[PDB]
């Protein structure tokens, strides 16, 4: 099913939880 | 030179009351930059940090050095880079960078901004060469959580300038993207307390997007970045939201291919929710997001239409979401302004968005819009009726003919009734809506049942408030344009009435809300589509404009305000434009009045402040020359001084139009043009060699060479070499930048080169020995045509280029140029031009001729 099926319940946690940009970008983790 | 003396030069350059001292100081500064760039740059950096110097001099030091390090021109960019690399010593470099970094953390934000721009310029040179490795560590540390606000903000500015100053079509900052993102996102995330810092971070992120492809291709980094951006769109502060939505829109445009999971999991719901915000700015943000989506999906469809096998794929975000998005847009239509102001607002953005939805999604837009229209077209509130006609007009482009025709038939009575609405806004938008109906499905208006009522509504509206009248003129233009081609055309039965109405609006005392100029524009349309069956109405226009010109020239301009004078000038321009169209359309009718007309034109040219209308006067003189042919010669002696003066005013647009006069007489004088050609060539050679020449002059002159060569034939041979040199130089000129302006200008230059070659090959049809040494050059140009869609996608461009292939082939039956006619790109181009069905039939005929001649060339 490769069609656009959006949810009415938004969740922007695409990965409060601590997160550093230095631990993400270039981190390869 | 010492720091203090240099600082005094800069200060005097901008702050001396004595203009002489300012220019002397500017000259000495530039001279030091040329004679000792190392010292100039070092001293500039020292003044930047010199507290004893006036602020403006310090800012000027930094910005002048910056402007010696980066440029828009790519060639200058490269020269500046190599000069920094080789002419500033390593120790000088280190001192300049240290001083710039010192200024970056200045408590004075103007110092910090100038320093950020300077740092950005140096970084743009060095980072692509794996140098200044300390900088990105400094930037990452500088936006760390416990740094002070000014250091965070200034560093984020520097990162923004870094990304903005690099060429958009470059990989200059790719190798630094990781650290750039770390530094930027550190300032953007929700934990950051300063609104200024979050704003600077999001703006910098937007600036950086073109350099983070490698990061976006990593799922974890893409996810985290999108999480931060979305988080920011839900922030409490409205400016932070605005910045975050700018980011989101740019990300959608650049990285559409990665947006399906983010759309599904959050952004669909979020943006739909906020489209109902009672705050017009917030709602506007969501609207712009959905307009970006629609624009990208329309562009995908277009690209796939040109190439069915392109990898690009639409996810159909808009189509799937219509049910939920469109009702909120429609609701936004009722947030107009309670007058007259015309300033942009969310209601206008929502209308534009609705039109994008209709173009992108066709029949799927109909149900929610038609429901809204039905609910509101008879409402008591003017905002709801205006919204209703706005929505109806906004869906006239997109759906198929069956649906549109059906619902236009159903709705036209109510729409025509709204032209009598008590609300000025309702009538204005209703007139527009009628224009939209006419423009996209004019056959939807039944000639017997509704076309008389449509015309009558336009005629009443031309006599209404100027805002209504303007839209009625636009609507009349649409009606004539869309109905004239049918045979028979019903619109001609209404030509007299329409023309009468338009003359009335053109006779307005003022041009408020552009109602008078718009009427003149519609008159031009009436002229250009007139047929013999309505000859009388054409005569009526001619009589009207000539007389009208006379009337304007009875006005004593010494009793007019500046505004009054501008209005009079615009009116005379409108008149002269229509008059030029009249003269060109019916040459036979022009002879008896020629003398009188020139009498007026010369008078207009001798007026004080003639510079404001002389362009339109030259356009009308050119039309008269084209129509009279040899009959124009009697005016040449008197016109020559004006013509030469205009041609030499290379900065003014009048020189372009004077070149257009040369183009006209080269065609209209036939044999008699030869006796002037040499003089013209001389002048033209000077003009295009003048450095003060505006850019638009170069293509015009190139094109007119083709006109001249076409008419004087073999007489052109002594100029040929020089002209060919020019053409070569022009066709090998790269765009100045990657910006749209530079690429478009380059397209204009190449189109003019095509004109030149067409005219030359036509003129030398019998002199193949003169053309022979340039054939390869011409074929190089043609290859440029076949490579760039901005050229070959244009029907006329491809027709001319493939025509060149054929005609040049026909000129050499000896086989001396057959080596060009076996190239895959030539054959393929001929076939694309012969087969592409958006190309006209004349183009395909020309491509057939070219194919015949090419195959014959291979036979040799």
UniProtKB/Swiss-Prot annotation, chain A:
FG repeats lie at residues 25-26. Phosphorylated by CDC28. It is found in: Nucleus, Nuclear pore complex; Nucleus membrane. It comes from the Eukaryota. Contains FG repeats. FG repeats are interaction sites for karyopherins (importins, exportins) and form probably an affinity gradient, guiding the transport proteins unidirectionally with their cargo through the NPC. FG repeat regions are highly flexible and lack ordered secondary structure. The overall conservation of FG repeats regarding exact sequence, spacing, and repeat unit length is limited. Component of the nuclear pore complex (NPC). NPC constitutes the exclusive means of nucleocytoplasmic transport. NPCs allow the passive diffusion of ions and small molecules and the active, nuclear transport receptor-mediated bidirectional transport of macromolecules such as proteins, RNAs, ribonucleoparticles (RNPs), and ribosomal subunits across the nuclear envelope. Due to its 8-fold rotational symmetry, all subunits are present with 8 copies or multiples thereof. Interacts through its FG repeats with nuclear transport receptors. Binds to the nuclear basket of the NPC through NUP60. Functions as a component of the nuclear pore complex (NPC). NPC components, collectively referred to as nucleoporins (NUPs), can play the role of both NPC structural components and of docking or interaction partners for transiently associated nuclear transport factors. Active directional transport is assured by both, a Phe-Gly (FG) repeat affinity gradient for these transport factors across the NPC and a transport cofactor concentration gradient across the nuclear envelope (GSP1 and GSP2 GTPases associated predominantly with GTP in the nucleus, with GDP in the cytoplasm). Present with 468 molecules/cell in log phase SD medium. This is Nucleoporin NUP1. It comes from Saccharomyces cerevisiae (strain ATCC 204508 / S288c) (Baker's yeast). The gene is NUP1.
UniProtKB/Swiss-Prot annotation, chain B:
InterPro entries: ARM-like, ARM-type_fold, Armadillo, HEAT_type_2, Importin-beta_N, Importin_beta. Residues 25-106 form the Importin N-terminal domain. It is found in: Cytoplasm; Nucleus; Nucleus, Nuclear pore complex. GO terms for cellular component: cytoplasm; cytosol; NLS-dependent protein nuclear import complex; nuclear envelope; nuclear pore; nucleus. The modification N-acetylserine is found at residue 2. Signal peptide: none annotated. HEAT repeats lie at residues 3-35, 37-66, 90-129, 134-164, 177-208, 219-255, 260-306, 317-361, 366-394, 401-441, 451-483, 495-529, 535-585, 591-628, 633-668, 674-712, 717-763, 772-811, 818-858. The keyword Metal-binding does not apply. The modification Phosphoserine is found at residue 835. The keyword DNA damage does not apply. Belongs to the importin beta family. Importin beta-1 subfamily. Forms a complex with the importin alpha subunit (SRP1/KAP60). Interacts with Ran (GSP1); interacts specifically with the GTP-bound form of Ran (GTP-Ran), protecting it from GTP hydrolysis and nucleotide exchange. Interacts with nucleoporin NUP1. Importin beta subunit that functions in nuclear protein import through association with the importin alpha subunit, which binds to the classical nuclear localization signal (cNLS) in cargo substrates. Docking of the importin/substrate complex to the nuclear pore complex (NPC) is mediated by importin beta through binding to nucleoporin FxFG repeats and the complex is subsequently translocated through the pore by an energy requiring, Ran-dependent mechanism. At the nucleoplasmic side of the NPC, GTP-Ran binds to importin beta and the three components separate, leading to release of the cargo. This is Importin subunit beta-1. It comes from Saccharomyces cerevisiae (strain ATCC 204508 / S288c). The gene is KAP95.
């Amino acid at each position: 099913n490769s069609s656009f099926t959006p949810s009415t319940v938004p969740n922007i946690n695409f990965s409060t939880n601590a997160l550093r940009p230095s631990d993400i970008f270039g981190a390869n983790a | 030179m010492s720091t203090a003396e240099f600082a005094q030069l800069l200060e005097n350059s901008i702050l001396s009351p004595d203009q002489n001292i300012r220019l002397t100081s500017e000259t000495q500064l530039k001279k030091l930059s040329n004679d000792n760039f190392l010292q100039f740059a070092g001293l500039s950096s020292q003044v930047l940090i010199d507290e004893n110097t006036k602020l403006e001099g310090r800012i000027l030091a930094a910005l002048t050095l910056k402007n010696e390090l980066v440029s828009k021109d790519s060639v200058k960019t490269q020269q500046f880079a190599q000069r920094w690399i080789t002419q500033v010593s390593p120790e000088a470099k280190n001192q300049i960078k240290t001083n710039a970094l010192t200024a970056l953390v200045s408590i004075e934000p103007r110092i910090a901004n100038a320093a950020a721009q300077l740092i950005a310029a140096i970084a743009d040179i060095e980072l692509p060469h794996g140098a200044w490795p300390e900088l990105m560590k400094i930037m990452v540390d500088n936006t760390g959580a416990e740094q002070p606000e000014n250091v965070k903000r200034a560093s984020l500015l520097a990162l923004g300038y870094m990304c903005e100053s690099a060429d958009p079509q470059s990989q200059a900052l790719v190798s630094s993207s990781n650290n750039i993102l770390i530094a930027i996102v550190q300032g953007a995330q929700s934990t950051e307390t300063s609104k200024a810092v979050r704003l600077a971070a999001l703006n910098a992120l937007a600036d950086s997007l073109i350099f983070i492809k490698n990061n976006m291709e990593r799922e974890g980094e893409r996810n985290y970045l999108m999480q931060v951006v979305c988080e920011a769109t839900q922030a409490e502060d409205i400016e932070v939201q605005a910045a975050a939505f700018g980011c989101l829109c740019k990300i959608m445009s650049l990285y559409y291919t990665f947006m399906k999971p983010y759309m599904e999991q959050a952004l669909y719901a979020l943006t739909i929710a906020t489209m109902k915000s009672p705050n017009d700015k917030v709602a506007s943000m969501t609207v712009e997001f959905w307009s970006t989506i629609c624009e990208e999906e329309i562009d995908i469809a277009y690209e796939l239409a040109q190439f069915p096998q392109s990898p690009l794929q639409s996810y159909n975000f808009a189509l799937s979401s219509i049910k939920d998005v469109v009702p909120n847009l429609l609701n936004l239509l009722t947030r107009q302004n309670e007058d007259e102001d015309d300033d942009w607002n969310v209601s206008m953005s929502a209308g534009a968005c609705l039109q994008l939805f209709a173009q992108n999604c066709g029949n799927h837009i109909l149900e929610p819009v038609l429901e809204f229209v039905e609910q509101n077209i008879t409402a008591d509130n003017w905002r709801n009726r205006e919204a209703a006609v706005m929505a109806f007009g906004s869906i006239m482009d997109g759906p198929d003919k069956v649906q549109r025709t059906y619902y236009v038939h159903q709705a036209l009575p109510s729409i025509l009734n709204l032209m009598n609405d008590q609300s000025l806004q309702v009538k204005e938008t209703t007139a527009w809506c009628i224009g939209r109906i006419a423009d996209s499905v004019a056959e939807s208006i039944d000639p017997q049942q509704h076309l008389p009522g449509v015309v009558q509504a336009c005629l009443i509206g031309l006599q209404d408030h100027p805002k209504v009248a303007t839209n009625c003129s636009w609507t009349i233009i649409n009606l004539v344009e869309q109905l004239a081609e049918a045979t028979p055309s019903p619109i001609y039965n209404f030509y007299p009435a329409l023309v009468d109405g338009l003359i009335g609006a053109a006779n307005r005392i003022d041009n408020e809300f552009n109602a008078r100029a718009s009427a003149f524009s519609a008159l031009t349309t009436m002229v250009e589509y007139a047929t013999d069956t309505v000859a009388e109405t054409s005569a009526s226009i001619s009589t009207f404009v000539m007389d009208k010109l006379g009337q304007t020239m009875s006005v004593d301009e010494n009793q007019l305000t500046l505004e009054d004078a501008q209005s009079l000038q615009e009116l005379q321009s409108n008149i002269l434009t229509v008059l030029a169209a009249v003269i060109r359309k019916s040459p036979s009718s022009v002879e008896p009045v020629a003398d009188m007309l020139m009498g007026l034109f010369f008078r207009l040219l001798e007026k004080k402040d003639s510079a404001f209308i002389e362009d339109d006067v030259f356009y009308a003189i050119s039309a008269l020359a084209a129509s009279l042919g040899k009959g124009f010669e009697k005016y040449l002696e008197t016109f020559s001084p004006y013509l030469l003066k205009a041609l030499n005013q290379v900065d003014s647009p009048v020189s372009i139009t004077a070149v257009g006069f040369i183009a006209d007489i080269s065609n209209s004088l036939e044999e008699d043009f030869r006796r002037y050609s040499d003089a013209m060539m001389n002048v033209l050679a000077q003009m295009i060699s003048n450095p003060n020449a505006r850019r638009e002059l170069k293509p015009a002159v190139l094109s007119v060479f083709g006109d001249i060569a076409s008419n004087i034939g073999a007489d052109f041979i002594p100029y040929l070499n020089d002209i060919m040199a020019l053409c070569v130089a022009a066709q090998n000129t790269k765009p100045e930048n990657g910006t749209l302006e530079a690429l478009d200008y380059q397209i204009k230059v190449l189109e003019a080169v095509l004109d030149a070659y067409v005219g030359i090959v036509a003129g030398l049809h019998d002199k193949p020995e003169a053309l022979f040494p340039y054939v390869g050059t011409i074929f190089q140009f043609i290859a440029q045509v076949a490579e760039d869609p901005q050229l070959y996608s244009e029907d006329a461009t491809s027709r001319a280029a493939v025509g060149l292939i054929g005609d040049i082939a026909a000129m050499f039956p000896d086989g001396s140029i057959k080596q060009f006619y076996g190239q895959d790109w030539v054959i393929d181009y001929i076939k694309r031009t012969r087969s592409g069905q958006l190309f006209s039939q004349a183009t395909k005929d020309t491509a057939r001729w070219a194919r015949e001649q090419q195959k014959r060339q291979l036979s040799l």
